[PDB]
Swiss-Prot record, chain B:
Ubiquitinated at Lys-26 by RNF14 and RNF25 in response to ribosome collisions (ribosome stalling). It comes from the Eukaryota. This is Small ribosomal subunit protein uS15. GO terms for cellular component: cytoplasm; cytosol; cytosolic ribosome; cytosolic small ribosomal subunit; extracellular exosome; focal adhesion; membrane; nucleolus. The gene is RPS13. Component of the small ribosomal subunit. The ribosome is a large ribonucleoprotein complex responsible for the synthesis of proteins in the cell. Part of the small subunit (SSU) processome, first precursor of the small eukaryotic ribosomal subunit. During the assembly of the SSU processome in the nucleolus, many ribosome biogenesis factors, an RNA chaperone and ribosomal proteins associate with the nascent pre-rRNA and work in concert to generate RNA folding, modifications, rearrangements and cleavage as well as targeted degradation of pre-ribosomal RNA by the RNA exosome. The modification N6-succinyllysine is found at K26, K33. Signal peptide: none annotated. PANTHER family: RIBOSOMAL PROTEIN S15P/S13E, SMALL RIBOSOMAL SUBUNIT PROTEIN US15. Belongs to the universal ribosomal protein uS15 family.
UniProtKB/Swiss-Prot annotation, chain C:
CDD domains: Ribosomal_S23 (cd03367). It comes from Homo sapiens. The lineage of its organism: Eukaryota, Metazoa, Chordata, Craniata, Vertebrata. The modification N6-acetyllysine is found at K134. Changing F119I: In BTDD; decreases hydroxylation of the protein; decreases the accuracy of translation; decreases levels of incorporation of the mutant protein into polysomes; patient cells become highly sensitive to oxidative stress. It is found in: Cytoplasm, Cytosol; Cytoplasm; Rough endoplasmic reticulum; Nucleus, Nucleolus. Residues 1-19 have a biased composition (Basic residues). Residues 1-25 are annotated as: Disordered. This is Small ribosomal subunit protein uS12. Hydroxylation at Pro-61 affects translation termination efficiency. NCBIfam families: PRK04211.1, uS12_E_A.
Curated annotation (Swiss-Prot), chain D:
Belongs to the universal ribosomal protein uS8 family. It is found in: Cytoplasm; Nucleus, Nucleolus. This is Small ribosomal subunit protein uS8. Component of the small ribosomal subunit. Part of the small subunit (SSU) processome, first precursor of the small eukaryotic ribosomal subunit. During the assembly of the SSU processome in the nucleolus, many ribosome biogenesis factors, an RNA chaperone and ribosomal proteins associate with the nascent pre-rRNA and work in concert to generate RNA folding, modifications, rearrangements and cleavage as well as targeted degradation of pre-ribosomal RNA by the RNA exosome. Required for proper erythropoiesis. Component of the 40S ribosomal subunit. Part of the small subunit (SSU) processome, composed of more than 70 proteins and the RNA chaperone small nucleolar RNA (snoRNA) U3.
From Swiss-Prot, chain E:
A zinc finger (C4-type) spans 36-58. The lineage of its organism: Eukaryota, Metazoa, Chordata, Craniata, Vertebrata. Residues 1-15 have a biased composition (Basic and acidic residues). Its cofactor is Zn(2+). Binds 1 zinc ion per subunit. InterPro entries: Ribosomal_eS27, Ribosomal_eS27_Zn-bd_dom_sf, Ribosomal_zn-bd. This is Small ribosomal subunit protein eS27. It comes from Homo sapiens. Expressed in a wide variety of actively proliferating cells and tumor tissues. Component of the small ribosomal subunit. Part of the small subunit (SSU) processome, composed of more than 70 proteins and the RNA chaperone small nucleolar RNA (snoRNA) U3. One of its GO terms (cellular component) is glutamatergic synapse.
Length: 30, 149, 141, 129, 82
RNA sequence: CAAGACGGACCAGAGCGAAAGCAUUUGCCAAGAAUGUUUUCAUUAAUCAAGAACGAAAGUCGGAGGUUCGAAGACGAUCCGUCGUAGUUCCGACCAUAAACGAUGCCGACCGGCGAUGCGGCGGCGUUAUUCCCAUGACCCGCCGGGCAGCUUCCGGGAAACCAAAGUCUUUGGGUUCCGGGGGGAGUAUGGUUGCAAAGCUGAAACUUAAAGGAAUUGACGGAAGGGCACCACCAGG
RNA sequence: UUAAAUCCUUUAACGAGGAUCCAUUGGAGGGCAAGUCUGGUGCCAAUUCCAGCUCCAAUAGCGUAUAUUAAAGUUGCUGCAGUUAAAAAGCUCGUAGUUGGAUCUCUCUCGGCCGAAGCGUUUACUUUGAAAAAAUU
């Protein structure tokens, strides 16, 4: 289908995106 | 799973949460202990004593009523054997299988199962040597095996 | 599954020692018998005496006839064959000359064009081939 | 056989959380398990739990809430000197803000921030983010 | 689906489960008291008894051991106890 | 009448065994899993280097027996046929190898549905044992436990075939054992060791090469096959 | 300057237009920077060899060879794999080594409230303190 390199990049990028989203959500609580 | 078999079965006894003696049991602790004494004088293993007391007299758990287990009760009076009952039954089974093997030399299945039995014997003997029930010079030997029974 | 106890250090490092031995580069670098079989003797260059000039045929899909020199190394007596950059640079080399010979370039591997030639000639008569080609220097005989 | 019941508890909770369950049963109970669950409770990750007491090792029914991404054990229980602690979180946490190394120290079972405040080290048990 | 109270199971489910796999394990057997047909005496017998149970005065077989629950002699009367 | 061999059909979606394997009746012998248990002991456990038991078939050494089949071999045809040696059968020693397969360690936890099957147990109306005079066997309904095997599934995983494990894995740690590190050289040389032998276990380097390999989707393609039509095709004729 | 010098620093005089007082080394017309180019030389327009031009990179430096490290998670503790790609032992009993369920909330004598003494079962673990060459970082 598509090489595993950009699948790994997409997964780690979306994971850091959830990290940033939950960081902003938890910062909003203060 | 089983120590030498490939079986993995769940079946066992399940004790209830109520450790209290039921109200309908009118036997006192010393009456139960006297039954234990006369049953042991009849020549019974603590397992057999527990089964008989559960079935006929209605004593569900001897430790819940008397406060001590059967082997400790027999030990305080002194009516307890030198080697424990599970090791006795294992050594008796090993003697029986070895007799069958000396009569029947082609039974390689019997050889394999005898090896299983005496390995179980070695594990239990190691445990009993570690917790001082057996003397440290005790060792299970093939000819001395029938002498223990 | 790998063991993960707090007292499994000896087992882990013994296993790693052995499985290190199962690698070609580690075994070549640690067995000693590669430098005991390398014609250069572990060196990057070596000098030699030009035994003769031979011709090696190139690969099948692109036919060519390249010209090499068979030289004998000074320090250990081994005979190797060495590549020359073009047919003009072959005229600067004579039988019974002193030559300084290096590897062909990819840390020890053969040529992807010319089959089984391993070495290239860098200097002849203690002067370089590059200077001789460009007219920067002359060579003695 | 069954060794390290804390690993079994944390794996059960993680597998329950990934299926979007609300409530999970844990057997057997332990002191270390209850302290770990209290640590996750105080940071608002696993809500509420109640210990069912039979006359054996007990059981725990835990009310999952939804914030928890991954709870995990670290086996073996590596010693964590206070310097090495920093390295540990960069190995286990996806950020330097959230996620929790849980240490058992002589001051108790706690997280890495409170262990840094109390200025002590100990054995690493897990992490949750 | 995915929404039930594990802390409070109903009697039918907790009865239906295996005796070890309940919320808190509990046995399925019981002690029951038996009147011999030839007498009046009460004998307390385990439901899953492995020994053949004789009357202490009449010596009549009350129950015979089977694979599970004990098989009472026909004529005997029994009552669930506690 | 006799000799040796072998237990078809029933015979599976079966079962048992650690595996190799296991199918005539009857008796004896000693084991065994699962189930049941308000028995007992009370951590006695898991996994394997060393060392040891068992290990299809073929094979080797002593006997016995040699019906069928049959390596070799002698003949006749031109992968087959007739005869049949060693063997195939039994007893006692060795050898310890197979596609010895799930091409897939073992122990433990968690994580969908279904209705079938084997054993044990529990509850329940009914039909049967020529309405059975109570239980018992055979069926029927449901549940529980350990199994063998399926179908299904955006649980997730995988390169894909597919997997309820080959999942709970870059969000990377339950415990522990064996083992691979590009293709050849080469299971070769050498040494050790086991074996009566055949062989078994261990096992390189020099050198050489740019690949080796796994999975899946695919147009055209001289052709090939099934049919149909036609007296500018055929049969019988003019 | 220095033992005496040289070099550097400081200063007279001379010292720049092709400021000839002239920067090299490698690579590019398949992929990371960089080509729809020219001329000789042979085989049956393609095609061996050779000289160039143009462009690109670093620059008083730039190639090459060999070893090694990093890329490399191809040695994997962090952190690999073992159906079909290299790979799980014929199978189970079969010691060592590795791992092992739940549980338990300070004082006695003698000298001025203190000092000595027994430590409290032993450790492992963690924090503190002493002590530990410079140079190197």
């Amino acid at each position: 289908v598509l090489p595993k390199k950009e699948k790994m990049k997409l997964r780690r990028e979306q994971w850091l995106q959830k990290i940033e989203a939950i960081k902003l959500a938890e910062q909003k609580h203060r | 799973g089983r120590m030498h078999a490939p079986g993995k079965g769940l079946s066992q006894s399940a004790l209830p949460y109520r450790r209290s003696v039921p109200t309908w049991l009118k036997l006192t602790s010393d009456d139960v202990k006297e039954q234990i004494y006369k049953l042991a004088k009849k020549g019974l293993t603590p397992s057999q004593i527990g089964v008989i007391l559960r079935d006929s007299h209605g004593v569900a758990q001897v430790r819940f009523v008397t406060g001590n287990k059967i082997l400790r009760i027999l030990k305080s009076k002194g009516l307890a054997p030198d080697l424990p009952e599970d090791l006795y039954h294992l050594i008796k089974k090993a003697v029986a299988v070895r007799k069958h093997l000396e009569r029947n030399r082609k039974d390689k299945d019997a050889k394999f199962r005898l090896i299983l039995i005496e390995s179980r014997i070695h594990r239990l003997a190691r445990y009993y040597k570690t917790k001082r029930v057996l003397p440290p010079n005790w060792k299970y030997e093939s000819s001395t095996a029938s002498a223990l029974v | 599954g790998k063991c993960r106890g707090l007292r499994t250090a000896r087992k882990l490092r013994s296993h790693r020692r052995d499985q290190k031995w199962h690698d070609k580069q580690y075994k070549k670098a640690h067995l000693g018998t590669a430098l005991k079989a390398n014609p250069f003797g572990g060196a990057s260059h070596a000098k030699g005496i030009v035994l003769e000039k031979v011709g090696v045929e190139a690969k099948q899909p692109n036919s060519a006839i390249r010209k090499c020199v068979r030289v004998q190394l000074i320090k250990n007596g081994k005979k190797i064959t060495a590549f020359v950059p073009n047919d003009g640079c072959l005229n600067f080399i004579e039988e019974n000359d002193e030559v300084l010979v290096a590897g062909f370039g990819r840390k020890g591997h053969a040529v992807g064009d010319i089959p089984g030639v391993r070495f290239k000639v860098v200097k002849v008569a203690n002067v370089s081939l590059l200077a001789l080609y460009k007219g920067k220097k002359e060579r003695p005989r | 056989v069954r060794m390290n019941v804390l690993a079994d508890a944390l794996k059960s909770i993680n597998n329950a959380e990934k299926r979007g369950k609300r409530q999970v049963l844990i057997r057997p109970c332990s002191k270390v398990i209850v302290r770990f669950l209290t640590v996750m409770m105080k940071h608002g990750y696993i809500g509420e739990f109640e210990i069912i007491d039979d006359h054996r090792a007990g059981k725990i029914v835990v009310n999952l809430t939804g914030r928890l991404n991954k709870c995990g054990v670290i086996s073996p229980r590596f010693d964590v000197q206070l310097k090495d602690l920093e390295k540990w979180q960069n190995n286990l946490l996806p950020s330097r803000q959230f996620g929790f190394i849980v240490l058992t120290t002589s001051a108790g079972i706690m997280d890495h921030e409170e262990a840094r405040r109390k200025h002590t080290g100990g054995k690493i048990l897990g992490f949750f983010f | 689906p995915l929404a039930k109270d594990l802390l409070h199971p109903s009697p039918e489910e907790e009865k239906r489960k295996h005796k070890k796999k309940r919320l808190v394990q509990s046995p399925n057997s019981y002690f029951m008291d038996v009147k011999c047909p030839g007498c009046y005496k009460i004998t307390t017998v385990f439901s899953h008894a492995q020994t053949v149970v004789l009357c202490v005065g009449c010596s009549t077989v009350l129950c015979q051991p089977t694979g599970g629950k004990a098989r009472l002699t026909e004529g005997c009367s029994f009552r669930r106890k506690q």
